[PDB]
Design an enzyme around this catalytic site. Structure first.
Site, PDB file in Angstrom:
ATOM      1  N   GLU B  24       0.823  -1.197   0.000  1.00 25.63           N
ATOM      2  CA  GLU B  24       0.000   0.000   0.000  1.00 25.63           C
ATOM      3  C   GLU B  24       0.863   1.255   0.000  1.00 25.63           C
ATOM      4  O   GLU B  24       1.719   1.427   0.869  1.00 25.63           O
ATOM      5  CB  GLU B  24      -1.000   0.017   1.167  1.00 25.63           C
ATOM      6  CG  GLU B  24      -1.726   1.369   1.289  1.00 25.63           C
ATOM      7  CD  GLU B  24      -3.053   1.322   2.030  1.00 25.63           C
ATOM      8  OE1 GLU B  24      -3.515   0.238   2.437  1.00 25.63           O
ATOM      9  OE2 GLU B  24      -3.648   2.394   2.195  1.00 25.63           O
ATOM     10  N   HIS B  26      -0.633   4.489  -0.317  1.00 18.04           N
ATOM     11  CA  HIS B  26      -1.725   5.471  -0.315  1.00 18.04           C
ATOM     12  C   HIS B  26      -1.244   6.917  -0.264  1.00 18.04           C
ATOM     13  O   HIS B  26      -1.829   7.795  -0.906  1.00 18.04           O
ATOM     14  CB  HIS B  26      -2.671   5.215   0.868  1.00 18.04           C
ATOM     15  CG  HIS B  26      -4.046   5.791   0.687  1.00 18.04           C
ATOM     16  ND1 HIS B  26      -5.138   5.334   1.393  1.00 18.04           N
ATOM     17  CD2 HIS B  26      -4.512   6.772  -0.123  1.00 18.04           C
ATOM     18  CE1 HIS B  26      -6.210   6.018   1.041  1.00 18.04           C
ATOM     19  NE2 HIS B  26      -5.858   6.896   0.121  1.00 18.04           N
ATOM     20  N   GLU B  69      -4.897   0.384  -2.225  1.00 17.05           N
ATOM     21  CA  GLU B  69      -4.665   1.824  -2.307  1.00 17.05           C
ATOM     22  C   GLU B  69      -3.250   2.220  -2.760  1.00 17.05           C
ATOM     23  O   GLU B  69      -2.513   2.916  -2.051  1.00 17.05           O
ATOM     24  CB  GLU B  69      -5.093   2.504  -0.991  1.00 17.05           C
ATOM     25  CG  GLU B  69      -6.619   2.418  -0.812  1.00 17.05           C
ATOM     26  CD  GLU B  69      -7.149   2.900   0.529  1.00 17.05           C
ATOM     27  OE1 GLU B  69      -6.527   2.624   1.580  1.00 17.05           O
ATOM     28  OE2 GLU B  69      -8.228   3.533   0.524  1.00 17.05           O
ATOM     29  N   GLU B 145     -14.408  -3.085  -0.032  1.00 17.43           N
ATOM     30  CA  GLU B 145     -14.810  -2.416   1.215  1.00 17.43           C
ATOM     31  C   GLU B 145     -16.139  -1.716   0.983  1.00 17.43           C
ATOM     32  O   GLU B 145     -16.320  -1.048  -0.034  1.00 17.43           O
ATOM     33  CB  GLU B 145     -13.776  -1.375   1.651  1.00 17.43           C
ATOM     34  CG  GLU B 145     -12.391  -1.944   1.964  1.00 17.43           C
ATOM     35  CD  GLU B 145     -11.297  -0.894   1.913  1.00 17.43           C
ATOM     36  OE1 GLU B 145     -10.362  -1.050   1.094  1.00 17.43           O
ATOM     37  OE2 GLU B 145     -11.372   0.088   2.685  1.00 17.43           O
ATOM     38  N   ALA B 147     -19.963  -0.321   3.510  1.00 15.45           N
ATOM     39  CA  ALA B 147     -20.657  -0.209   4.796  1.00 15.45           C
ATOM     40  C   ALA B 147     -19.662   0.092   5.921  1.00 15.45           C
ATOM     41  O   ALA B 147     -19.433  -0.732   6.822  1.00 15.45           O
ATOM     42  CB  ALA B 147     -21.458  -1.479   5.087  1.00 15.45           C
ATOM     43  N   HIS B 148     -19.061   1.278   5.846  1.00 18.03           N
ATOM     44  CA  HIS B 148     -18.029   1.685   6.789  1.00 18.03           C
ATOM     45  C   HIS B 148     -18.621   1.711   8.213  1.00 18.03           C
ATOM     46  O   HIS B 148     -19.471   2.546   8.528  1.00 18.03           O
ATOM     47  CB  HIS B 148     -17.468   3.049   6.375  1.00 18.03           C
ATOM     48  CG  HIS B 148     -16.149   3.378   6.997  1.00 18.03           C
ATOM     49  ND1 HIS B 148     -16.012   4.333   7.978  1.00 18.03           N
ATOM     50  CD2 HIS B 148     -14.908   2.878   6.782  1.00 18.03           C
ATOM     51  CE1 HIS B 148     -14.741   4.418   8.335  1.00 18.03           C
ATOM     52  NE2 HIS B 148     -14.051   3.540   7.630  1.00 18.03           N
ATOM     53  N   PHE B 209     -10.137   7.485  13.556  1.00 18.71           N
ATOM     54  CA  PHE B 209     -10.371   6.848  12.242  1.00 18.71           C
ATOM     55  C   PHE B 209      -9.832   5.417  12.136  1.00 18.71           C
ATOM     56  O   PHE B 209     -10.093   4.715  11.151  1.00 18.71           O
ATOM     57  CB  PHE B 209      -9.896   7.727  11.071  1.00 18.71           C
ATOM     58  CG  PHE B 209     -10.540   7.373   9.747  1.00 18.71           C
ATOM     59  CD1 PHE B 209     -11.916   7.498   9.575  1.00 18.71           C
ATOM     60  CD2 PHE B 209      -9.772   6.905   8.678  1.00 18.71           C
ATOM     61  CE1 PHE B 209     -12.527   7.167   8.357  1.00 18.71           C
ATOM     62  CE2 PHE B 209     -10.372   6.568   7.453  1.00 18.71           C
ATOM     63  CZ  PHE B 209     -11.760   6.699   7.299  1.00 18.71           C
TER      64      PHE B 209
END
Ligand code: 2DG
Ligand code: MG
Ligand code: MG
Ligand code: NA
Ligand code: NA
Ligand code: NA
Ligand code: NA
Ligand code: NA
Ligand code: NA
EC number: 3.2.1.23
Lengths: 1019, 211
Positions: B24, B26, B69, B145, B147-148, B209
């Site tokens: 990743e 990102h 990502e 991914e 439905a956070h 987060f």
């Protein structure tokens, strides 16, 4: 000793380390600081050459190198030219091996005794280069791996012998004098990927240079050209990348020039479009330029534009300019056809190594240009870079002269067992990917490059698939090909076999070579087929070449091939008297070696043509001819150009005597036809065969040819009037004189002697001068050609090879046994009748039955009927030979010529009256064999002698026995008198490959019974 | 790639697994800066190839993933093909660069909504029902991914499932995510409490987060 980290890490035995501190690859840079200089491609003051006199010392291993060498010159070192291969200066031996690695196969390890070249240079750098910007060094080619030091400090490390390695020396250099130290290793883990069938050399063999770039610099640029349906509109798209601090005032201007006219221009600040959630490339910009009615690039018309890329401030300050030649062309595969600018290509190609007989693997402009002119003059339109990226100038020359290029990654692992052992191994993917990706990054802007290749002879592994896809992703403008693992794998857009035959299948397990015609239509197959290698031109070869071209022309999806190959890899050695001679494998003490297998070229190392070159030129002609009545139909195979520098010359002759000639301008559209009605021809005076010859002459000189260049030709038989007139009746009668040992025949000054124990003509006299040094005897063998021998690896013999079968059958050992020898006296002639049997260990191989009829006119008619046992291997020839006492200066014949031609290689030859010096009747193949045959000959003249009939002959100062016993041409010695080999029949030479039987059935002497007649008289 | 015991447990208890390469990037700008760079192909390839060599005999692993990502670069395309070549038994997916690039067998967006388009430039998140029928599109769609589940969440979860059940080619997705990444800290009295970003003096940080 030089230490510590450098000797400790042994980076040259680690495929995970292919470089240290090396700069990113990119297209050719010069960093012009004037845009006009960039446009005109004039030298750049920011690009300095470091070629010339360097210092060099040789060591047996890196451990033997003294630590002091890093700081100061070694007294024991010599002054040598760079670029060079150190074998070419005599420091150690070049090695010729084909498949088997020159080192023990123990990856990633190399031998502890690792020849090490220590190069060094003291040079000046101006203060102005160090006050600002970036000073880098560029090594275009170092073989096979090297460490670099500058002023005693370690800079970096590099691998891959065939791409530039660049290092930033800004922080290493001082004003005034500087010293580079380069330790070059002969063997490295890189060597496992460099197993090409060629001389194994080493050293700094391409250019060394210093480049100055500003701190804010063009770091990369890509040029693309896309088109509408009819190519009347194009968009040039140039992506430009910068390094340095990003600033709002920065701009790029891309301007496009046709000569002195600017046709298009665009200016933009940096900052690409959004590409993902994080934004776009702030350090990139793409300019799009519209071009109406672009002049298209091809090999036929290599139209080029100049693109100038300017990095500048908005308000007009140029920071630097880069540039390239731009060729507007589209390459795509559609519906199974490889198209260029919408039209299907027919690849008239050849593989070309970077080889020079004196300088080894160092290339120069003159040699390159020489090669290109010769290729184009012989109707080649394409080259494969076998098997590595080339010297950068090569692509520039191909852009400008017009040749299609296959650019090929420096990856060959042929000696591995199985061949894909490394290429299927993910641990070797990193080393492989750099050899592919750095090539693409370097060469992607050259219009001449139309196809990428993943390397050569490395089987098929998953790494191939990954890199295939990498290329398709980064450059969709070019097809990708690769032959390994069966020539039609998932890693190739093009079916690209080597030595697949036209009609004959070779159904090897796993990797069969199908008939090329069959291959195209295999269930599910749709791709075009272009052979990466075909028509192996080893020595006396290229038999069956016409068969390929016939198939290429008949089958849309058969789009040609690349001949193997351009130039013999012979090297110059010198004898005791300082005289030069051509050497091959093993001649340098190199062992093991594969001898002459490095010599496969259409031309000699000095670029003198082999006879096969004319066959290639003829079959690759761009004009095709048909005749109906007196109408000649000319068809053009050009795709883009009209015939605007061509005239047709025609000639009608009666057995070599010109009856009529003339010329007509050619006015043929690409793919078009033109009908040419010949004028009424005069009736022939004498009897015989009328022959029409047409040739295409180029009146005007070009960049690649002189005025008067012949580009194409064809011959037809016209009317034949058979001689029905009896020769004038002679009054004289020859006299027979008989002894127990001999029949002697006399007629005026002429005498014949037939030995009654041997059954052969043992002597002839003209005046009282003897004519023969060796009796006239049947011959059923030839000094074996490379194709007959059929060896590609010194330690490997094919029992099916023609030479092997002839030897085991006793053809070379067979002894003539007399069965009959009688004499008869006719009304106006003496008749000698003979029969012989050739036997080997109780087996009769051949029977020869002859009559010799000597009449009152002095002519001797020899009728020969030969039986060949059906179960003996088909013989190389069926003819007679003798050694003549006479040595004459000229050879004159009515038959196919002027050059050497064989039954399966005679399409280029023309029937006419030819007259050459005797020396031209011998072809100096470096490995000597049967040579210099001319076929379809009706009359041969040599000194006082004339032979007439319908035969093939060769004539020279060298016997078949000597040619057979001699390994090198320089070791041949002229024998007393002249050896004449006159054949009723001769076997094809083959060459579809040179390591298995390759002579097609129709060119084998399999008829069992053979008949021919010769008339021998005095002129 | 997970701890080796995880696949054994998924084999034995029965769970379909997407095995994902440790790649990743990102934070790069743009996201594909490294993954489109041939100099980063070697480091990237090892993260993919060594995963495959380790886990390829696990029945629970049904799909390979090229990572997360990291935009879409030419390195993804090369590695996609590498897997396809060495293991034809499993589909390869990858969401980066718009979720429907040439480096994925499965349209695998993150947080694409059921009915509502999010037409971001270059990387739009189409309505999943719409995405399926874009001109020329044929692939299945499974969200990598959706439905956070951050705090008081999973509103509209039933809307996804209604759509998954109605549309054959809408084949579900992977909720983000299973477990809060909270860590235990202790107060002056030695009583435990749940900590998140910033609670360790870590700065900069992204606070809650991680939960
Ligand atoms: C194809 C590969 C090339 O390098 C040569 O080995 C040729 C045979 O001489 O075959
Ligand atoms: Mg290494
Ligand atoms: Mg080879
Ligand atoms: Na064709
Ligand atoms: Na060879
Ligand atoms: Na003309
Ligand atoms: Na010989
Ligand atoms: Na569904
Ligand atoms: Na999160």
């Amino acid at each position: 000793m030089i230490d510590p980290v450098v000797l400790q890490r042994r980076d040259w035995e680690n495929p995970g380390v292919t470089q240290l501190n090396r700069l990113a690859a990119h297209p050719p840079f010069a960093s012009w600081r004037n845009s006009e200089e960039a446009r005109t491609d004039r030298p750049s003051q920011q690009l300095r050459s470091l070629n010339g006199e360097w210092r060099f010392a040789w060591f047996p291993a890196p451990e033997a190198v003294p630590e002091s060498w890093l700081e100061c010159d070694l007294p024991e070192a010599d002054t040598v030219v760079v670029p060079s291969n150190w074998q070419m200066h005599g420091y150690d031996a070049p090695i010729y091996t084909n498949v088997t690695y020159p080192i023990t196969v123990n990856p990633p390890f190399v031998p502890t005794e690792n020849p090490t070249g220590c190069y060094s240079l003291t040079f000046n750098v101006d203060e102005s280069w160090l006050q600002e910007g970036q000073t880098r060094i560029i090594f275009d080619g170092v073989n096979s791996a090297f460490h670099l030091w500058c002023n005693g400090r370690w800079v970096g490390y590099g691998q891959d012998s065939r791409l530039p390695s660049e290092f930033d020396l800004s922080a290493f250099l001082r004003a005034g004098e500087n010293r580079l130290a380069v330790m070059v290793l002969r063997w490295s883990d890189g060597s496992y990927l460099e197993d090409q069938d060629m001389w194994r050399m080493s050293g700094i063999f391409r250019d060394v240079s210093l480049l100055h770039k500003p701190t804010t610099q063009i770091s990369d640029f890509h040029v693309a050209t896309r088109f509408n349906d009819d190519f009347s509109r194009a968009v040039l798209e140039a992506e430009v990348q910068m390094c340095g601090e990003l600033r709002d005032y920065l701009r790029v201007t891309v301007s496009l020039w046709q000569g002195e006219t600017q046709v298009a221009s665009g200016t933009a600040p940096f900052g690409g479009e959004i590409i993902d959630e994080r934004g776009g490339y702030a350090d990139r910009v793409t300019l799009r330029l519209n071009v109406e009615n672009p002049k298209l690039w091809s090999a036929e018309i290599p139209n080029l534009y100049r693109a100038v890329v300017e990095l500048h401030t908005a308000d007009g300050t140029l920071i630097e300019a880069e540039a390239c030649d731009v060729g507007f062309r589209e390459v795509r595969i559609e519906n199974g056809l490889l198209l260029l600018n919408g039209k299907p290509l027919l690849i008239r190609g050849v593989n070309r190594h970077e080889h020079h007989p004196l300088h080894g693997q160092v290339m120069d402009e003159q040699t390159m240009v020489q090669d290109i002119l010769l290729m184009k003059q012989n109707n080649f339109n394409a080259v494969r870079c076998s098997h590595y990226p080339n010297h950068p100038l090569w692509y520039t020359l191909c852009d400008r002269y017009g040749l299609y290029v296959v650019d090929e990654a420096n990856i060959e692992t042929h000696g591995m067992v199985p061949m894909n052992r490394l290429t299927d191994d993910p641990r070797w993917l990193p080393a492989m990917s750099e050899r592919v990706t750095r090539m693409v990054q370097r060469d992607r802007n050259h219009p001449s490059v139309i196809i990428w290749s993943l390397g050569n002879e490395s089987g098929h592994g998953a790494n191939h698939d990954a890199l295939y896809r990498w290329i398709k992703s980064v450059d969709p403008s070019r097809p990708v090909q690769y032959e390994g693992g069966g020539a039609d794998t998932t890693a190739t857009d093009i079916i690209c076999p080597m030595y697949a035959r036209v009609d004959e299948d070779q159904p090897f397990p796993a990797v069969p070579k199908w008939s090329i015609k069959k291959w195209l239509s295999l269930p599910g197959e749709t791709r075009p087929l272009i052979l990466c290698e075909y028509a192996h031109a080893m020595g006396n070869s290229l038999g069956g070449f016409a068969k390929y071209w016939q198939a290429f022309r008949q089958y849309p999806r058969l789009q040609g091939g690349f001949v193997w190959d351009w130039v013999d890899q012979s090297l110059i050695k010198y004898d005791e008297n300082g005289n030069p001679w051509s050497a091959y494998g093993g001649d340098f003490g190199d062992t093991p070696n594969d001898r002459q297998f490095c010599m496969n070229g259409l031309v000699f190392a000095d670029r003198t043509p082999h006879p096969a070159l004319t066959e290639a030129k003829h079959q690759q002609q761009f004009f095709q001819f048909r005749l109906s009545g007196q109408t000649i139909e000319v068809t053009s195979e050009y795709l883009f150009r009209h015939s605007d520098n061509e005239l047709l010359h025609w000639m009608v002759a009666l057995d070599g005597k010109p009856l009529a000639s003339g010329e007509v301008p050619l006015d043929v559209a690409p793919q078009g036809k033109q009908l040419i009605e010949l004028p009424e021809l005069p009736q022939p005076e004498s009897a015989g065969q009328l022959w029409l010859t047409v040739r295409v002459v180029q009146p005007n000189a070009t960049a690649w040819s002189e005025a008067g260049h012949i580009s194409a030709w064809q011959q037809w038989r016209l009317a034949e009037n058979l001689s029905v007139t009896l020769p004038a009746a002679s009054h004289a009668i020859p006299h027979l004189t008989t002894s127990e040992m001999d029949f002697c025949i006399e007629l005026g000054n002429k005498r014949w002697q037939f030995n009654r124990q041997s059954g052969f003509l043992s002597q002839m006299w003209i005046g009282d001068k003897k004519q023969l040094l060796t009796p006239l005897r049947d011959q059923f063998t030839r000094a074996p050609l490379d194709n007959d021998i059929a060896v590609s690896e010194a330690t490997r013999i094919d029992p099916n090879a023609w030479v092997e079968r002839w030897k085991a059958a006793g053809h070379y050992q067979a002894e003539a046994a007399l069965l009959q020898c009688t004499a008869d006296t006719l009304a106006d002639a003496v008749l000698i009748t003979t029969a012989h049997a050739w036997q080997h260990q109780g087996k009769t191989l051949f029977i020869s039955r002859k009559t010799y009829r000597i009449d009152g006119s002095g002519q001797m008619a020899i009728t020969v009927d030969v039986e060949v046992a059906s179960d003996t291997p088909h013989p190389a020839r069926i003819g007679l030979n003798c050694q003549l006492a006479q040595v004459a200066e000229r050879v004159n014949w009515l038959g196919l010529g002027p050059q050497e031609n064989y039954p399966d290689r005679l399409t280029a030859a023309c029937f006419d009256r030819w007259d050459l010096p005797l020396s031209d009747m011998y072809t100096p193949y470096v490995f000597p064999s049967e040579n210099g045959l001319r076929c379809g000959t009706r009359e041969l003249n040599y000194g006082p002698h004339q032979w007439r009939g319908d035969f093939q002959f060769n004539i020279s100062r060298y016997s078949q026995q000597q040619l057979m016993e001699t390994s090198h041409r320089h070791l041949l010695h002229a024998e007393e008198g002249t050896w004449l080999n006159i054949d009723g029949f001769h076997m094809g030479i083959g060459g579809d490959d040179s390591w298995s039987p390759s002579v097609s059935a129709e060119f084998q002497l399999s008829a069992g019974r053979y008949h021919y007649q010769l008339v021998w008289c005095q002129k």
